[PDB]
Coordinates of C-alpha atoms in Angstrom, one line a residue:
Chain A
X16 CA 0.0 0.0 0.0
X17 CA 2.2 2.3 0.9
X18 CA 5.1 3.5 -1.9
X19 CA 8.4 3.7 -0.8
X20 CA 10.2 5.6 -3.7
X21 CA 11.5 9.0 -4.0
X22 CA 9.4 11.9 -4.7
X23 CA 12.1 13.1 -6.8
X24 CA 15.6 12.2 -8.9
X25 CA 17.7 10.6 -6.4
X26 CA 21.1 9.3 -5.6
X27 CA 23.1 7.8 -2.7
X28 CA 26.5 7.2 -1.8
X29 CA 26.5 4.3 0.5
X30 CA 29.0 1.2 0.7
X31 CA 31.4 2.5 -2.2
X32 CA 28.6 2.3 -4.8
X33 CA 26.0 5.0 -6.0
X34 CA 22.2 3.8 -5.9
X35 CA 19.4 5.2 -7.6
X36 CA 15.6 5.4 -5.7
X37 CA 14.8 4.7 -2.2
X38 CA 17.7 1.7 -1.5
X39 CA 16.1 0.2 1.9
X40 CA 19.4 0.6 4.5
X41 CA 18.5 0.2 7.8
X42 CA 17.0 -3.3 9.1
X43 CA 14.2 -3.6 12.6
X44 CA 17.1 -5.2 14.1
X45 CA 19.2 -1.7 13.2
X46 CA 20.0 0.6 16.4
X47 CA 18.9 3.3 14.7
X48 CA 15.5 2.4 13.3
X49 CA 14.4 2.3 17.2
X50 CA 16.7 4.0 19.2
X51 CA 17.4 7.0 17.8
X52 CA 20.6 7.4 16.7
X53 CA 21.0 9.4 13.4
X54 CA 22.4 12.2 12.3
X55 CA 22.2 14.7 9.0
X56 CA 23.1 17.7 7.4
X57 CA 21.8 19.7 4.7
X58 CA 23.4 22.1 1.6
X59 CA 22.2 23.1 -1.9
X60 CA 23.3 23.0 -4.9
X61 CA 22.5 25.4 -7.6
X62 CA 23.7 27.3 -11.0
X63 CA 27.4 25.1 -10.4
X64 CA 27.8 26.7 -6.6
X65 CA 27.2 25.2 -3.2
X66 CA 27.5 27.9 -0.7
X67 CA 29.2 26.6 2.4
X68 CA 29.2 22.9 1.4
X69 CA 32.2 22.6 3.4
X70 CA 31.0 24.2 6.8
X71 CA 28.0 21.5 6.8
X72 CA 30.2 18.7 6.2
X73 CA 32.1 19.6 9.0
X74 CA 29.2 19.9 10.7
X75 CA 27.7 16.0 10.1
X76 CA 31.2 15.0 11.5
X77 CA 30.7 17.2 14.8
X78 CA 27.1 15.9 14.9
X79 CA 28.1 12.6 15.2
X80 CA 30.3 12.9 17.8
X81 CA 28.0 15.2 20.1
X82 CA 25.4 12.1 19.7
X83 CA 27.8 9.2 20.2
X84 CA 28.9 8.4 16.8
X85 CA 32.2 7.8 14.9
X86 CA 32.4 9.9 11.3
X87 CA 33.9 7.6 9.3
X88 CA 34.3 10.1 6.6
X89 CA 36.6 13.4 6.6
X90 CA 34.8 16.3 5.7
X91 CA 37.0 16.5 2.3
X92 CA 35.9 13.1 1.1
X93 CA 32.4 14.1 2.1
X94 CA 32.4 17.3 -0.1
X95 CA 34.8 15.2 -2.8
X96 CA 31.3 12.6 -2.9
X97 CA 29.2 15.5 -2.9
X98 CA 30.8 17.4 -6.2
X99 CA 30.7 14.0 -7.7
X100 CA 27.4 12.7 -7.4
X101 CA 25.8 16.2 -8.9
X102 CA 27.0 15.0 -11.9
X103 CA 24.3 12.7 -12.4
X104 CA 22.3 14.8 -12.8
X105 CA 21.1 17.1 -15.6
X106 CA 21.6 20.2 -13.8
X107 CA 18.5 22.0 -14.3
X108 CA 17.1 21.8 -11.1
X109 CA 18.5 22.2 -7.2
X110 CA 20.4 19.5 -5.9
X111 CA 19.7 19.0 -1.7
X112 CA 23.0 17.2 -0.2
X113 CA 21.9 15.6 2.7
X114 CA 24.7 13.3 4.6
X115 CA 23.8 10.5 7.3
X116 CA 25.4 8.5 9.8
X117 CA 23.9 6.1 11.9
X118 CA 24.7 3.3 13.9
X119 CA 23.8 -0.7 13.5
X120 CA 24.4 -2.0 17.3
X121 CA 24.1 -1.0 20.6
X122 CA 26.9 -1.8 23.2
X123 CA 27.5 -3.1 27.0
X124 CA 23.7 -1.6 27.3
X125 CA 21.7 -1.6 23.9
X126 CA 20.2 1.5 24.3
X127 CA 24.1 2.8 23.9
X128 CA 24.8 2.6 20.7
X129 CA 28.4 1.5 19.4
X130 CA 30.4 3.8 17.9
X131 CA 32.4 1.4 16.2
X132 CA 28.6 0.4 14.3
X133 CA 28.5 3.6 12.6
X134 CA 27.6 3.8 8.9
X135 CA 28.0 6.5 6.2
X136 CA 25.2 7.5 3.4
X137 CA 25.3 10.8 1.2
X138 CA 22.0 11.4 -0.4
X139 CA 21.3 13.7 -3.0
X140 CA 18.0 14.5 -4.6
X141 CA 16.5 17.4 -6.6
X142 CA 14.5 20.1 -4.7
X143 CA 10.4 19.9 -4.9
X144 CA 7.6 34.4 -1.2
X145 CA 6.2 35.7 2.2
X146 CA 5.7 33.3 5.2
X147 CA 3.3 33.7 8.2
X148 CA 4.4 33.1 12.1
X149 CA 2.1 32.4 15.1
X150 CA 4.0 31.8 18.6
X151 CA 4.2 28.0 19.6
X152 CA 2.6 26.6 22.7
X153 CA 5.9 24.1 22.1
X154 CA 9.5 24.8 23.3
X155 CA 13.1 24.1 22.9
X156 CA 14.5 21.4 25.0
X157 CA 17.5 22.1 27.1
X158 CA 20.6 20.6 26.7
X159 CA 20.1 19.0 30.1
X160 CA 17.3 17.1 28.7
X161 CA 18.1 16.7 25.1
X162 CA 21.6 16.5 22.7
X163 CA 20.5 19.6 21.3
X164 CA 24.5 19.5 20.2
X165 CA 23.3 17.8 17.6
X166 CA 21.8 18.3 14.2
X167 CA 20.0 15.1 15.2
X168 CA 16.6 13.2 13.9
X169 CA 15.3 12.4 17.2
X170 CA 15.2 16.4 17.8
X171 CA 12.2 16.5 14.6
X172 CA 9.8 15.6 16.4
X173 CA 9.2 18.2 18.5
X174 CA 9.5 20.1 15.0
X175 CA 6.7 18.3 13.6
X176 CA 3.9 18.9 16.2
X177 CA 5.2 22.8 16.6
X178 CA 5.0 23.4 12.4
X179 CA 1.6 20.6 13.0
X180 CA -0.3 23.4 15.2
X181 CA 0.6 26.4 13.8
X182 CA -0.6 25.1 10.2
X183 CA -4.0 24.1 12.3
X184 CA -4.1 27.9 12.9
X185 CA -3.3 29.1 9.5
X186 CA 0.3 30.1 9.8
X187 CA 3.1 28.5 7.8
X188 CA 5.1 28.5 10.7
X189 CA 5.8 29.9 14.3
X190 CA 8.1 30.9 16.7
X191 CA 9.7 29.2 19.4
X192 CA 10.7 29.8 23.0
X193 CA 13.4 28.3 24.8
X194 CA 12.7 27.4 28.3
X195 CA 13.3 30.6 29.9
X196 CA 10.8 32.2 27.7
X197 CA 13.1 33.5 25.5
X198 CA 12.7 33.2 21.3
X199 CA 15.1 30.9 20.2
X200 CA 14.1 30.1 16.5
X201 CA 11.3 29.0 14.3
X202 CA 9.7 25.8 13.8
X203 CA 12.2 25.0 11.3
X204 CA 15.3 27.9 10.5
X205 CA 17.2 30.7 12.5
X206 CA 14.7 33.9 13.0
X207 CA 15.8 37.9 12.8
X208 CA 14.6 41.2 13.1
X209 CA 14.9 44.9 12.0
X210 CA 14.6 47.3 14.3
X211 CA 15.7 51.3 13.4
X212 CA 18.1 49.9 11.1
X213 CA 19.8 47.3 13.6
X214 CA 19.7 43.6 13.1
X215 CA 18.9 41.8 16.3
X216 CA 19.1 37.8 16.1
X217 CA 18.2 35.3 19.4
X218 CA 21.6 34.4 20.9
X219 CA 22.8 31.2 21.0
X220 CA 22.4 29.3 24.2
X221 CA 22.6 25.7 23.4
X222 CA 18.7 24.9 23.0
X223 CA 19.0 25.3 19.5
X224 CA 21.1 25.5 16.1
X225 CA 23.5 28.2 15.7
X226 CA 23.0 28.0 11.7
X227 CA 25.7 28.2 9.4
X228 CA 23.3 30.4 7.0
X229 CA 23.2 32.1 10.1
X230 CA 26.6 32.8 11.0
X231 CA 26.8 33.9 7.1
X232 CA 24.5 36.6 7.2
X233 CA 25.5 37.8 10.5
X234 CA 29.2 38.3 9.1
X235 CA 27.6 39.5 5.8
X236 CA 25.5 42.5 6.9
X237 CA 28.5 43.7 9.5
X238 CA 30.8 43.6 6.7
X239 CA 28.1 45.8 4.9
X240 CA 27.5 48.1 8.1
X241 CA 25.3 47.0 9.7
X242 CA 25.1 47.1 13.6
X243 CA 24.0 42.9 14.4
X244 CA 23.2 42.1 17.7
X245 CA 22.8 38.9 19.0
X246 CA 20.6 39.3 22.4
X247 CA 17.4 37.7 24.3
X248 CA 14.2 38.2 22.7
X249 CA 11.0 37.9 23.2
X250 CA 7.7 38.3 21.6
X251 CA 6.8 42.0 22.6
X252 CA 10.4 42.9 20.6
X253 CA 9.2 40.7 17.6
X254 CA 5.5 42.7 17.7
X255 CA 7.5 45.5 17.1
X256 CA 9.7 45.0 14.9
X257 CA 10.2 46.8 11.6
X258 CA 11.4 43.6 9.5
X259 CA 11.4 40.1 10.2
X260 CA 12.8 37.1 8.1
X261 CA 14.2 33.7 8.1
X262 CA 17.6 31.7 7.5
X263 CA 18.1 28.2 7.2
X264 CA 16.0 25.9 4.7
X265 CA 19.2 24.7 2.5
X266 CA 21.1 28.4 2.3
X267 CA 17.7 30.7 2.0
X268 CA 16.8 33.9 3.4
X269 CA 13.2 34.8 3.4
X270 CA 10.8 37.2 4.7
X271 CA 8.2 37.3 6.9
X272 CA 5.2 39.0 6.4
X273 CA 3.1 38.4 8.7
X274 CA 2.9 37.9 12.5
X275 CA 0.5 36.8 14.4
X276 CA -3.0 39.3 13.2
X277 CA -0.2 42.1 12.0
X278 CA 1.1 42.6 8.0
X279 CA 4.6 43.8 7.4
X280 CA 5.9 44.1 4.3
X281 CA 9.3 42.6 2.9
X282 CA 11.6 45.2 4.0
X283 CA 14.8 46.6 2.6
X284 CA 17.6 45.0 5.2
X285 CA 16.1 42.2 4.3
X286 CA 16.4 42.5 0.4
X287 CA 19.7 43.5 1.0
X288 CA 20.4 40.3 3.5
X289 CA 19.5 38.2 0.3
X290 CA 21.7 40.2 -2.1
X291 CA 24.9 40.2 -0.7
X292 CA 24.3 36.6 0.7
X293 CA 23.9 36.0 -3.5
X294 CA 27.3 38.5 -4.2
X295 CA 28.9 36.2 -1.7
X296 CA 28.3 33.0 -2.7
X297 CA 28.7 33.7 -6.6
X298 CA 31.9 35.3 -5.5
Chain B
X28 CA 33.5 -3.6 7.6
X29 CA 30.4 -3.5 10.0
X30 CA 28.3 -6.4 10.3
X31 CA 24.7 -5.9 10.2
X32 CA 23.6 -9.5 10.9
X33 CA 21.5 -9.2 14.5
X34 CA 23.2 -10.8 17.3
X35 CA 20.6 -13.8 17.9
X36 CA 18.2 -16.0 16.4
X37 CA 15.4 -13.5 14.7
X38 CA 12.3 -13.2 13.4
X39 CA 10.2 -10.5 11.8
X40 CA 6.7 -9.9 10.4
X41 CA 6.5 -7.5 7.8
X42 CA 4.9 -6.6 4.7
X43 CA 3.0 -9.9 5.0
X44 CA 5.9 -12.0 5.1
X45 CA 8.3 -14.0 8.0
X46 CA 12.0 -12.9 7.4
X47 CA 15.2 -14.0 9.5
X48 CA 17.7 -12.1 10.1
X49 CA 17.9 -8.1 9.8
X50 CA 16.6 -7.4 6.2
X51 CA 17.1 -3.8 5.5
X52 CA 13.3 -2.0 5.7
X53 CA 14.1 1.9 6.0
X54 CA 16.0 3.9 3.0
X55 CA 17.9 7.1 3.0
X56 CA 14.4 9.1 1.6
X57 CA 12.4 7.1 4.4
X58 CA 11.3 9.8 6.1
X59 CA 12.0 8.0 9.2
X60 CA 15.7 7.6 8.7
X61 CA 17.0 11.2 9.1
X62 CA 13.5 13.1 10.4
X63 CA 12.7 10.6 14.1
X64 CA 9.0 9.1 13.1
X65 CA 9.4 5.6 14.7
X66 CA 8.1 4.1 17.7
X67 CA 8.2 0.6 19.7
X68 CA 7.1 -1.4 22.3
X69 CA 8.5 -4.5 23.9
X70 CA 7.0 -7.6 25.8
X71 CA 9.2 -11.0 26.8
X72 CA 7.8 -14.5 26.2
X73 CA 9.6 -17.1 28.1
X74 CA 8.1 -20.2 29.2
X75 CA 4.8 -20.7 27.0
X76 CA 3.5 -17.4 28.5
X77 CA 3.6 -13.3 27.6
X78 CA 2.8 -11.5 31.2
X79 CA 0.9 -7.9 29.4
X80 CA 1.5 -8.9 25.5
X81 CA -2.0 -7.5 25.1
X82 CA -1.3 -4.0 26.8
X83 CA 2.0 -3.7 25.5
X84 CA 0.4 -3.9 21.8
X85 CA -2.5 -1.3 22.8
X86 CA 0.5 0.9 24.0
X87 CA 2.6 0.9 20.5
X88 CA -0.6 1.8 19.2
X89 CA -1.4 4.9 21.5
X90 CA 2.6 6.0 20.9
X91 CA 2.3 5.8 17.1
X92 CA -0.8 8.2 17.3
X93 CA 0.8 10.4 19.7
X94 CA 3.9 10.9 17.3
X95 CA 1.8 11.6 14.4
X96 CA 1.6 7.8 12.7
X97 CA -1.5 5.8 12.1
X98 CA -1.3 2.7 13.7
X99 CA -2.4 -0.1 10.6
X100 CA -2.7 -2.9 12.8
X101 CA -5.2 -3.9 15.8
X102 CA -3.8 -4.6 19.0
X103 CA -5.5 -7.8 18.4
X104 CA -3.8 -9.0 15.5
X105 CA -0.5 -7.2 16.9
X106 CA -0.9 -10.0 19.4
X107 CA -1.8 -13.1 17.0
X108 CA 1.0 -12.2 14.6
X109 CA 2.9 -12.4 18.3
X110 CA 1.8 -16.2 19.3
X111 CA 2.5 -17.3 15.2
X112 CA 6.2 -15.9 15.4
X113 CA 6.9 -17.2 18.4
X114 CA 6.6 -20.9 17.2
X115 CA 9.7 -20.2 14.4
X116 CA 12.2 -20.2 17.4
X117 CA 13.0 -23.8 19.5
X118 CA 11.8 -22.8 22.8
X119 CA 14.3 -23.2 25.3
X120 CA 15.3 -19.1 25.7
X121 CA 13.1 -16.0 25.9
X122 CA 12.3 -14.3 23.3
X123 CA 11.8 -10.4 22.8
X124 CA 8.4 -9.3 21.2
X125 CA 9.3 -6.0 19.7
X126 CA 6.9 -4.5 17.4
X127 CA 7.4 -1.0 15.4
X128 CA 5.8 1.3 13.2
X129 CA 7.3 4.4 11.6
X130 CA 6.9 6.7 8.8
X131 CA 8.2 6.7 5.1
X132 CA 7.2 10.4 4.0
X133 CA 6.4 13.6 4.8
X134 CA 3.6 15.9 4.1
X135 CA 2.2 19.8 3.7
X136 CA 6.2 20.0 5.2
X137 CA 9.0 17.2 5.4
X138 CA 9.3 17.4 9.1
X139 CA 5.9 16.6 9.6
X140 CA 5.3 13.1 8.7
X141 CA 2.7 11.7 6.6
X142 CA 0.2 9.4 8.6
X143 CA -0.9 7.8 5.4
X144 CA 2.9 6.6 5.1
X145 CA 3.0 4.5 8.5
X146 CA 4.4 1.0 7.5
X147 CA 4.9 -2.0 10.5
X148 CA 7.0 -4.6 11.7
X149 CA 6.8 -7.1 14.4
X150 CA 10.7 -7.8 15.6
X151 CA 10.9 -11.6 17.3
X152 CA 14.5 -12.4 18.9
X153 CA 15.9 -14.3 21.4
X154 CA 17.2 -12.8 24.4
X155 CA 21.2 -12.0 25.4
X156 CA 21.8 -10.2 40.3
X157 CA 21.4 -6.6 42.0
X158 CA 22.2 -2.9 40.5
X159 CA 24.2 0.1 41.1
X160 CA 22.9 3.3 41.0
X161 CA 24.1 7.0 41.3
X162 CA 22.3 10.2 40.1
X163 CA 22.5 11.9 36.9
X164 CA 23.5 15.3 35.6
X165 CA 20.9 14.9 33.1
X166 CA 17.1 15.7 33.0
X167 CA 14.1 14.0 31.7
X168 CA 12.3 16.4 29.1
X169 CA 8.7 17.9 29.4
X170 CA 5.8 17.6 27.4
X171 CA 6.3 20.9 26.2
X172 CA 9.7 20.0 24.6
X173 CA 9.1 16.2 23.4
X174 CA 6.8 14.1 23.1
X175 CA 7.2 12.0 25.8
X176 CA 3.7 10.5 25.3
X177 CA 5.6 8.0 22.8
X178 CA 7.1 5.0 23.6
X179 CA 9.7 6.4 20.6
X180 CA 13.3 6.1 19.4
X181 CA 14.0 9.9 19.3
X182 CA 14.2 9.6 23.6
X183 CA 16.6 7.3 23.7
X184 CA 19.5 8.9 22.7
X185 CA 19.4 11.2 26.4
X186 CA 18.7 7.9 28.0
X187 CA 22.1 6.9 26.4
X188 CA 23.9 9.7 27.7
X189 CA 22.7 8.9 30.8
X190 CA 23.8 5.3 31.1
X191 CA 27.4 6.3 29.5
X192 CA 28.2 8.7 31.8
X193 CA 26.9 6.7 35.2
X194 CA 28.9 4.1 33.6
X195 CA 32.0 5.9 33.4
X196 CA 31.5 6.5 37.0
X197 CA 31.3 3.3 37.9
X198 CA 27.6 2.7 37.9
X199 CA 24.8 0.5 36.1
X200 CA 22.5 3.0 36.1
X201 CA 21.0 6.6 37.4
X202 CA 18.2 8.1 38.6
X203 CA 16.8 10.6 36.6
X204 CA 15.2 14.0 37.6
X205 CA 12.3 15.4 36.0
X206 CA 12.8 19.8 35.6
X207 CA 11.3 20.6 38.6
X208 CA 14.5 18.2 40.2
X209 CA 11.9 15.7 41.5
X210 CA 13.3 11.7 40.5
X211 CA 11.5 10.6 37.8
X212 CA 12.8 6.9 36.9
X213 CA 16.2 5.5 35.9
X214 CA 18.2 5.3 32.4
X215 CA 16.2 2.4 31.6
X216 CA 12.9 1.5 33.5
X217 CA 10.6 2.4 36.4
X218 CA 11.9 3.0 40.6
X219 CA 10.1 2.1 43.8
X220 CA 11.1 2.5 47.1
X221 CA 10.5 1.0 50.5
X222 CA 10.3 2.8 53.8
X223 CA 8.8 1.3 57.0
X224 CA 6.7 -1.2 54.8
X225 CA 5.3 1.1 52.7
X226 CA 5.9 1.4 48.9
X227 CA 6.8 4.5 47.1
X228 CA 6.8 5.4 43.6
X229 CA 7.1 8.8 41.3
X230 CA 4.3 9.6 40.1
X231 CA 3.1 9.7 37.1
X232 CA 3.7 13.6 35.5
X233 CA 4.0 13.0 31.7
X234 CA 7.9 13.1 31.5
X235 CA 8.7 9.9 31.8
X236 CA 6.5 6.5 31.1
X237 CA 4.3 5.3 33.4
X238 CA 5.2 1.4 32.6
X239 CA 3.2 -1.4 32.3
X240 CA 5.2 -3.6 34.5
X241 CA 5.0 -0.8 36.7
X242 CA 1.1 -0.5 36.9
X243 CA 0.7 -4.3 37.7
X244 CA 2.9 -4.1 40.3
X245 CA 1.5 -1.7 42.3
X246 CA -1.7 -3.5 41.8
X247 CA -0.1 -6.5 42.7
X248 CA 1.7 -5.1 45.9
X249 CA -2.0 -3.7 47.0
X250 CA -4.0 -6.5 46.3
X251 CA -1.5 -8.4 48.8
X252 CA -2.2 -6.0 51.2
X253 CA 0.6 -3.4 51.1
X254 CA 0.6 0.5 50.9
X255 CA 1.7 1.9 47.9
X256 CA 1.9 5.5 47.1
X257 CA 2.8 7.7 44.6
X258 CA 4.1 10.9 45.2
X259 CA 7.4 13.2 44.8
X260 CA 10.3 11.8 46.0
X261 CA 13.6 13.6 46.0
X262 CA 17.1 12.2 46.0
X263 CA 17.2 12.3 49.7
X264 CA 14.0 10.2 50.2
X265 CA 16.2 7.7 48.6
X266 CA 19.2 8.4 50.1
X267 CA 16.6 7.4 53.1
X268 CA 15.3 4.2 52.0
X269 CA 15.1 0.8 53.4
X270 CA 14.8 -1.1 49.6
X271 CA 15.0 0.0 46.1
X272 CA 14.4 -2.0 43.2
X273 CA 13.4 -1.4 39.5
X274 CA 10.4 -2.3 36.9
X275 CA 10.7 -2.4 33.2
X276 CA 13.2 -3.8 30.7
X277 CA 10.9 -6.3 29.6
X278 CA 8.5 -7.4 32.5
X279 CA 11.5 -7.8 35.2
X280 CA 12.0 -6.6 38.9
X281 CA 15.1 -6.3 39.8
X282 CA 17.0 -5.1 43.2
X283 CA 18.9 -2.4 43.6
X284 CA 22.0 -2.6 46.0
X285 CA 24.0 0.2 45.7
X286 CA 22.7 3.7 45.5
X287 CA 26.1 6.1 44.9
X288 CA 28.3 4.7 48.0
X289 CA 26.3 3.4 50.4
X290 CA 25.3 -0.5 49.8
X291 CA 21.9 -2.1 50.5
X292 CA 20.1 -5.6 50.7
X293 CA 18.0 -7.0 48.4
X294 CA 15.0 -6.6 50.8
X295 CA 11.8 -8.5 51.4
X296 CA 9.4 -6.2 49.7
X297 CA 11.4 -7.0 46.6
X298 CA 11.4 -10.0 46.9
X299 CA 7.4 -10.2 47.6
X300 CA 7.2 -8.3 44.2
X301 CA 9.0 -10.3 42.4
X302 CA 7.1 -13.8 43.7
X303 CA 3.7 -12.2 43.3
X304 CA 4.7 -11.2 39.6
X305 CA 5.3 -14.7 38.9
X306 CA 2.4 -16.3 40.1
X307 CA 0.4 -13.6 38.5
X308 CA 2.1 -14.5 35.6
X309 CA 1.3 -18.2 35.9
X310 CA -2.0 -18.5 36.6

């Protein structure tokens, strides 16, 4: 009943070979199909660049280790793969570069899982505007509670049922607060704001992902001028804010335009964000 | 170089079909593999019976509809699909009844999975003395920040950390606090204590599962005329206590004697709970 193929072009590195489709990988006696122990990244392809392919393949590696994992790959061989396997391809469309490692076995206790039983796939496949934001009744775990270290699967979840309500409300997506309160990020990518020309941007305190789009644009807009403040926020600052907008999402910068009952248009740090984001990676 | 073969006799039901081994069932575009949409149960046949089989498949039920999944299968036939695996295998060890459903897309967004994509697996495999236990730097999450209404893989990996690091002290096993610094349960099952006679339990506060094993127990213990309460307990109520001893990790009760450096007796109580289980068992 149920079909497992790809909803788009697809191809995997895994075990020295490169597989077309949906290749099944991970068996029910698997550590990771029921203990949680995977780990991914994410960069885009497009128009012959892949804007800080590099960063996120150092980032997988870092990943693993934060959730108990041995990379078995250096980050080289990883991009190496990468540049490789978008040759298969026709070109015409984005390419998403998504590597995985997981691990087969637990250890001396089974919900531990064995470093030495970690496994290596690199999955590429071809990519299938103002955005809306509520506030989440969800939050951010801590990293007391969680390996929010991680750019982790077993974090999703959480993800799912925050982007889950907010659609049953009629946003696209929401904000979410750390467990102090504080706005950490949005259901799924880094979250700024504009306010009398300065960019403020929640800092990073372990509860969540401090993007590498992130960290790009930050370095971008000082370079250009601006004054970029990473601080605490919370929702009265976001209410009144000039701009708002998004990073994250495979290397994107995108508006917001709307929060909560209030319209805002797509303002001009914003535009600019994109632009030299663009220079930079074309450059 | 790692070997994926599971490490004892196995059986699983899936897609209709009996398979040995660990035939590979998730791909690298199963939504499941990078994006945390599985959930499990487990129940332990040994000895022509299965103490709770029938709760324990109601339970992976209720957790695949509280991560999102549509459970496919009746607890019922969960349960018959149980009793027909069990006759592959000769008999003479216990066998682990773990059965799983996850998801193989996702929808509106890719974090949020599909509940039309739900597939399922039943997992048959034969199995492979009093515990140490000190506290742990880590937390359990909230309901707020997981969903810890899911018997699902993407817990696990703090209940890892957990065990690692009271290992590398020198223990089997921690208690775990909830975020209000009240003990919740260990790494890997359900704690009771005895003081003066009476039984004492965390209760139930939606951070931690409320076992099976556990709930018979206490109704086992009451029926046979003892007191059992649950309530808060901190880590000096146990610091306190006259017995400690475990439920979970597949229908077991098991003594605890050690808590950090002072050593205990396997105590009465204990051992009351653990001959009343058995003849419940039994009959």
């Amino acid at each position: 009943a149920v079909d497992t193929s790809p909803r788009s072009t697809t191809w995997t590195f895994v075990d020295g070979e490169w597989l077309a489709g949906n290749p099944p990988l991970i068996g029910p006696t698997s550590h990771a199909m029921w203990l949680g122990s995977t780990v991914f990244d994410g960069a885009r392809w497009f128009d012959g660049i892949a804007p800080d392919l590099d960063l996120h393949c150092q980032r997988v590696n870092r990943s693993a280790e934060a959730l108990g994992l041995k990379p078995t790959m250096s980050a080289e061989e990883i991009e190496g793969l990468a540049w490789e396997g978008v040759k298969k391809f026709d070109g015409k469309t984005a390419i998403y570069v998504k590597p995985m490692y997981w691990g087969e076995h637990g250890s001396w206790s089974v919900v531990a899982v064995d470093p030495e039983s970690t496994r290596f796939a690199l999955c590429l496949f071809e990519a299938p505007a103002g955005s809306s934001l509520t506030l989440s009744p969800f939050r951010r775990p801590t990293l007391e509670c969680m390996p929010t270290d991680a750019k982790a699967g077993c974090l999703y979840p959480n993800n799912a049922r925050i982007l889950n309500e907010a659609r049953s409300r009629g946003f696209d997506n929401a904000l979410v607060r750390d467990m102090l309160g504080n706005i950490a990020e949005t259901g799924s990518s880094n979250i700024f704001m504009v306010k009398d020309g300065v960019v403020f941007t929640p800092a990073a305190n372990r509860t969540f992902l401090a993007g590498i789009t992130r960290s790009r644009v930050m370095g971008l807009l000082s370079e250009a001028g601006f004054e970029v403040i990473e601080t605490s926020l919370t929702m009265a600052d976001f209410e009144g804010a000039d701009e708002i907008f998004t990073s994250g999402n495979y290397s994107k910068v995108l508006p917001v335009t709307r929060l909560e009952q209030r319209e805002l248009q797509a303002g001009p740090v914003t535009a600019k964000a994109r632009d030299l984001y663009m220079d930079w990676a074309h450059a």
